[PDB]
Amino acid sequence: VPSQKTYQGSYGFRLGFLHSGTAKSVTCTYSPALNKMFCQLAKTCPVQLWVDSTPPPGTRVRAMAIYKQSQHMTEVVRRCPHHERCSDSDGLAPPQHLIRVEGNLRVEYLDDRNTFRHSVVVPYEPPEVGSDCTTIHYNYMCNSSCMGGMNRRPILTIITLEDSSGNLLGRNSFEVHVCACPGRDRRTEEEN
Amino acid sequence: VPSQKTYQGSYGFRLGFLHSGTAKSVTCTYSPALNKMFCQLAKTCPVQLWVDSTPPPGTRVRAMAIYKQSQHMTEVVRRCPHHERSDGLAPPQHLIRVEGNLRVEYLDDRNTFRHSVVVPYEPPEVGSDCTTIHYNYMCNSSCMGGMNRRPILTIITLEDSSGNLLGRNSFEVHVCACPGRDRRTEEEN
Amino acid sequence: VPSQKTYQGSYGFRLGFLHSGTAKSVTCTYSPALNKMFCQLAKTCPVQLWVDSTPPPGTRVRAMAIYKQSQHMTEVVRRCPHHERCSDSDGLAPPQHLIRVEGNLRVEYLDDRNTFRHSVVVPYEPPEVGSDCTTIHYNYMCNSSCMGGMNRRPILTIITLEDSSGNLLGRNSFEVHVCACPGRDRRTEEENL
Amino acid sequence: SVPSQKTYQGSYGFRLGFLHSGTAKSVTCTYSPALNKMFCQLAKTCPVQLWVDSTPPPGTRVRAMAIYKQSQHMTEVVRRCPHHERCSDGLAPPQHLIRVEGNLRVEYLDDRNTFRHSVVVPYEPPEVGSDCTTIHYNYMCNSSCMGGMNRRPILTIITLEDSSGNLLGRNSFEVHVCACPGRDRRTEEENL
Ligand SMILES: *C[C@H]1C(=O)C2CCN1CC2
Numbered sequence: 231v232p233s234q235k236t237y238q239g240s241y242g243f244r245l246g247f248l249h250s251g252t253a254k255s256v257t258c259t260y261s262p263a264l265n266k267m268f269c270q271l272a273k274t275c276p277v278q279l280w281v282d283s284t285p286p287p288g289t290r291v292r293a294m295a296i297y298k299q300s301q302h303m304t305e306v307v308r309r310c311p312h313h314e315r316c317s318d319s320d321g322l323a324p325p326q327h328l329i330r331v332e333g334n335l336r337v338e339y340l341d342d343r344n345t346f347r348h349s350v351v352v353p354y355e356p357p358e359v360g361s362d363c364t365t366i367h368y369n370y371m372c373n374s375s376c377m378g379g380m381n382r383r384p385i386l387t388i389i390t391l392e393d394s395s396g397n398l399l400g401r402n403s404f405e406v407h408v409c410a411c412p413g414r415d416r417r418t419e420e421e422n
Numbered sequence: 423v424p425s426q427k428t429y430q431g432s433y434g435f436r437l438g439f440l441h442s443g444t445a446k447s448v449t450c451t452y453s454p455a456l457n458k459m460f461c462q463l464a465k466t467c468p469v470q471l472w473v474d475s476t477p478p479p480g481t482r483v484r485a486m487a488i489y490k491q492s493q494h495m496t497e498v499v500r501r502c503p504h505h506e507r508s509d510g511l512a513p514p515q516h517l518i519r520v521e522g523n524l525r526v527e528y529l530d531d532r533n534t535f536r537h538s539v540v541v542p543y544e545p546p547e548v549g550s551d552c553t554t555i556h557y558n559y560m561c562n563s564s565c566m567g568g569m570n571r572r573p574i575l576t577i578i579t580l581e582d583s584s585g586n587l588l589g590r591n592s593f594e595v596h597v598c599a600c601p602g603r604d605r606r607t608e609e610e611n
Numbered sequence: 612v613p614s615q616k617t618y619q620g621s622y623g624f625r626l627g628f629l630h631s632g633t634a635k636s637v638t639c640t641y642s643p644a645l646n647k648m649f650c651q652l653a654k655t656c657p658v659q660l661w662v663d664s665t666p667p668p669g670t671r672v673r674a675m676a677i678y679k680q681s682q683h684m685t686e687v688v689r690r691c692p693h694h695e696r697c698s699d700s701d702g703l704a705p706p707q708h709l710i711r712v713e714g715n716l717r718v719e720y721l722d723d724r725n726t727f728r729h730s731v732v733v734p735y736e737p738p739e740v741g742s743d744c745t746t747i748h749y750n751y752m753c754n755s756s757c758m759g760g761m762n763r764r765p766i767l768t769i770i771t772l773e774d775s776s777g778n779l780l781g782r783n784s785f786e787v788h789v790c791a792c793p794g795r796d797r798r799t800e801e802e803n804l
Numbered sequence: 805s806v807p808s809q810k811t812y813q814g815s816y817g818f819r820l821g822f823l824h825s826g827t828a829k830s831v832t833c834t835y836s837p838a839l840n841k842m843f844c845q846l847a848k849t850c851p852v853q854l855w856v857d858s859t860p861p862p863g864t865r866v867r868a869m870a871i872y873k874q875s876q877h878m879t880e881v882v883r884r885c886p887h888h889e890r891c892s893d894g895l896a897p898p899q900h901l902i903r904v905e906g907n908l909r910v911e912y913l914d915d916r917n918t919f920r921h922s923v924v925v926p927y928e929p930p931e932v933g934s935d936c937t938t939i940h941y942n943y944m945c946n947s948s949c950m951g952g953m954n955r956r957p958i959l960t961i962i963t964l965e966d967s968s969g970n971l972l973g974r975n976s977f978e979v980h981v982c983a984c985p986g987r988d989r990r991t992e993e994e995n996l
Pocket residue numbers: 697698706
C-alpha cells in the first residue's frame with residue numbers, strides 16, 4: 231500500500247486550493263474543515279503546489295488515488311467498466327486511469343509493473359510571474375457513485391514531489407468526491 | 423465596486439451592537455452617532471442580526487470590506503504582507519474572519535478578486551432575541567501596505583441558499599490599540 | 612561511535628561564534644542557551660577557533676557529524692540520495708559528505724576505511740594579524756528536513772584539534788540545525804525558556 | 805554613522821520609569837530625575853521600567869545599546885575594558901557592557917555593519933495587577949575603567965521594536981557606573 235504520510239521535506243512542500251466557495255455554478259470546491267475536494271466528472275480541478283524553496287529543473291509531481299477505508303486500501307483505484315469503454319481518451323491517458331492531467335503536453339502515465347497502481351506525472355515548473363504557487367489542472371474520469379468503480383467508496387489523492395532520479399522530496403494528500411453539484415455536496419457535508 | 427446601498431428587504435433585516443461604552447479596557451465598541459465599530463486586531467467583534475421574520479433554512483450571512491473613500495473604493499481590501507506571512511480555515515490574505523463557527527466559508531471572487539466570509543444564518547437561541555456573529559479583523563487600520571489608515575466599511579448581506587440578495591446593511595470599522603479612547607475622541611469632533 | 616567529550620588540552624582550545632542575532636534575513640545564528648547553530652543549505656557557517664597558545668606547525672582541524680539521539684548514533688551522517696547526486700559544484704568535496712569547508716584550497720576529506728565515518732580536515736593557521744581567533748567557513752549540504760538523509764533528526768558537529776600524526780590535542784562540540792530561516796527558528800525555539 | 809538618541813514615544817506612548825530609591829549610603833542603584841541620570845554599581849541589578857499607553861503586540865522586542873555622550877567620542881563603539889572583557893555568564897558576549905539578568909530569552913547582537921553591541925529581550929506586558937514592565941540590566945565596567953569608557957560619560961538607548969526590527973519607541977538616559985551611587989547622586993545634584 232502506498233504511504234500517505236505528509237512530509238514537507240527540504241523545499242517546504244504543501245498543497246493549496248482556490249477559495250472558490252459553494253455557489254450552484256462552482257466546477258470544483260475544496261473544504262478546509264474536511265480536507266476534501268468536491269469536483270465534477272472530467273472537469274478542471276486545480277491543485278496548487280507551494281514551496282519555501284525552488285526544487286531544481288527536472289523535479290516531477292506525481293498523483294495517485296487510493297481507497298481511504300482500510301478494508302479496501304489494497305484494491306487498485308480504477309475507472310468503472312462503463313467509463314473504461316468510452317470514446318473519451320485524450321490519446322495520452324490510458325482509458326483505465328481515474329486521474330488525468332489537462333493542458334500539459336509533457337504528462338506521463340504509469341501502470342506500476344509490481345503493485346499495478348495507476349499514476350500520472352508532470353514536470354515541476356516554478357510559479358508564473360505575479361503568482362506564488364504552481365497550479366496543476368487534474369481531471370477525475372469517474373463519479374464517486376459509478377457502479378463497480380469506486381461505488382461510493384471514499385478515496386484519497388496522494389501528491390508526491392520527486393527528483394529526476396525518483397528520490398522522494400515531499401508528500402501531501404486530500405480526500406476527493408466526484409459529483410454533479412460540488413457546491414451543494416460540500417455545504418451539506420459541512421453541516422455535520 | 424459592489425453595491426453598498428442599505429435594504430432591510432422582505433425579512434426586516436437590521437444590524438444591532440452591544441452597548442459596550444468607552445472604558446479603557448473595552449475590546450470593541452460601537453458608536454451609534456458615527457455608525458462606526460472600534461475594535462482591536464484579531465479580537466472578538468460581536469455583530470447582531472435583527473429580523474422581524476425568520477429567514478428559511480439555508481439562509482447565509484456574508485461580510486465584505488471596501489474602502490470608504492471614492493478614490494480607493496475600487497482597490498481590494500486585503501491584509502498587509504507583514505500580517506499575511508492563522509486558524510487553518512481562513513485564507514491568510516483575508517482581513518475579516520468569523521470566530522467559533524466550523525461552518526465558516528471563505529470566497530476569493532474569481533473576477534473581482536474581492537474577499538468575503540460567509541456563515542449559515544441560525545435563528546436566535548431560546549432566550550436570545552438576536553443572532554450574534556463574532557468577526558475578527560486581522561489587520562490594524564494603520565498597517566503599512568494594507569489599509570494604510572484608509573477608512574473601510576463592512577457590508578453585511580443576507581442571501582438565500584441560491585445566492586439571491588434578501589437584505590444589506592453596513593458600518594465603518596476602525597481597527598486600533600484602544601477602541602474606548604478612539605471612539606470618545608472621534609465623538610468629540 | 613566517535614568521542615564527543617570536551618577537551619581544551621595543552622593549547623587551551625575553545626570554540627566561539629558570531630553574535631549574529633535572529634533578524635529574518637540572517638544566514639547563520641548560534642543560540643548560546645541551546646549550544647545550537649542555525650544555518651542555511653550550502654551557505655557559510657563561521658566557526659571560530661580560540662587558543663591560549665599557538666599549536667605547533669602542521670597542526671590540523673577536523674569536523675565530523677554524529678546523530679544526537681541514542682537510537683541513531685551508530686549510523687553514519689551523510690547527505691540524502693536527492694542531494695548526494697553529483698553536481699557541477701565542489702570538485703574538492705565528495706558528493707556524499709554533509710560537511711564542507713569553503714574558501715580553503717588545502718581542505719582534505721576522509722571516508723574512514725574502518726568506521727566509514729565522513730570528515731573534513733584543514734591545516735590550523737593562527738589568528739590573522741590583529742585578530743584574536745581563527746575562523747573556518749563550514750557549509751552543511753542537506754536541510755535537517757531532507758527525506759532520506761538526516762530526515763528531521765538532530766546532529767552534532769564534533770571539532771577536533773590534532774597534530775601532524777593525528778593525535779588528539781583538543782575537542783569541542785556543537786548541535787546543528789539546517790533550515791530555511793535560522794533567525795525565525797532560533798527565536799521560536801528559545802521562546803520555550 | 806552614530807545611532808539616534810532622539811526621544812520618540814511613537815504609537816503606544818513609550819516612556820521609561822525608575823524606582824524612587826533615594827541616596828542612602830547602602831543604595832546599589834539610584835536614578836536622578838533632575839539629571840535624567842542613573843547611578844549604579846558594576847554588575848549589580850539596574851531596574852528600568854517600560855510604561856506604555858497601549859500594549860504593543862507579542863513579538864515586540866526591547867533593545868538596549870550604549871553610546872558615548874560627548875560628540876568627539878560618539879562614533880567610538882562602547883565596549884568593556886580589556887581587564888573586564890577577559891572571559892562571563894555564558895549567555896552574554898564577554899565584550900558587552902550591558903547584560904540582562906534573569907531572562908533566559910535574552911539575545912546579544914554585534915552589528916555586522918556598525919559593530920555596535922546590544923541586548924534585546926521580548927516585551928512582556930505587565931502583571932495583571934502592575935503598571936509597568938521591569939528589565940534588570942547589569943553594567944559590566946565602571947565609568948572609571950582605564951582602557952574602556954575611561955571616565956567618558958555614556959547614554960543607554962532603549963528602543964521598542966517590532967518582530968521585524970522597525971522602530972516603535974525610543975527613550976534614553978545617562979548612566980554613571982561608580983562605587984557609591986547615593987553619594988555620587990547627591991554630590992552631583994548638590995550644585996543645583
Ligand atoms: C560525480 C561522480 C563522478 O563521476 C566522479 C566525481 C564524483 N562522483 C564520483 C566520481
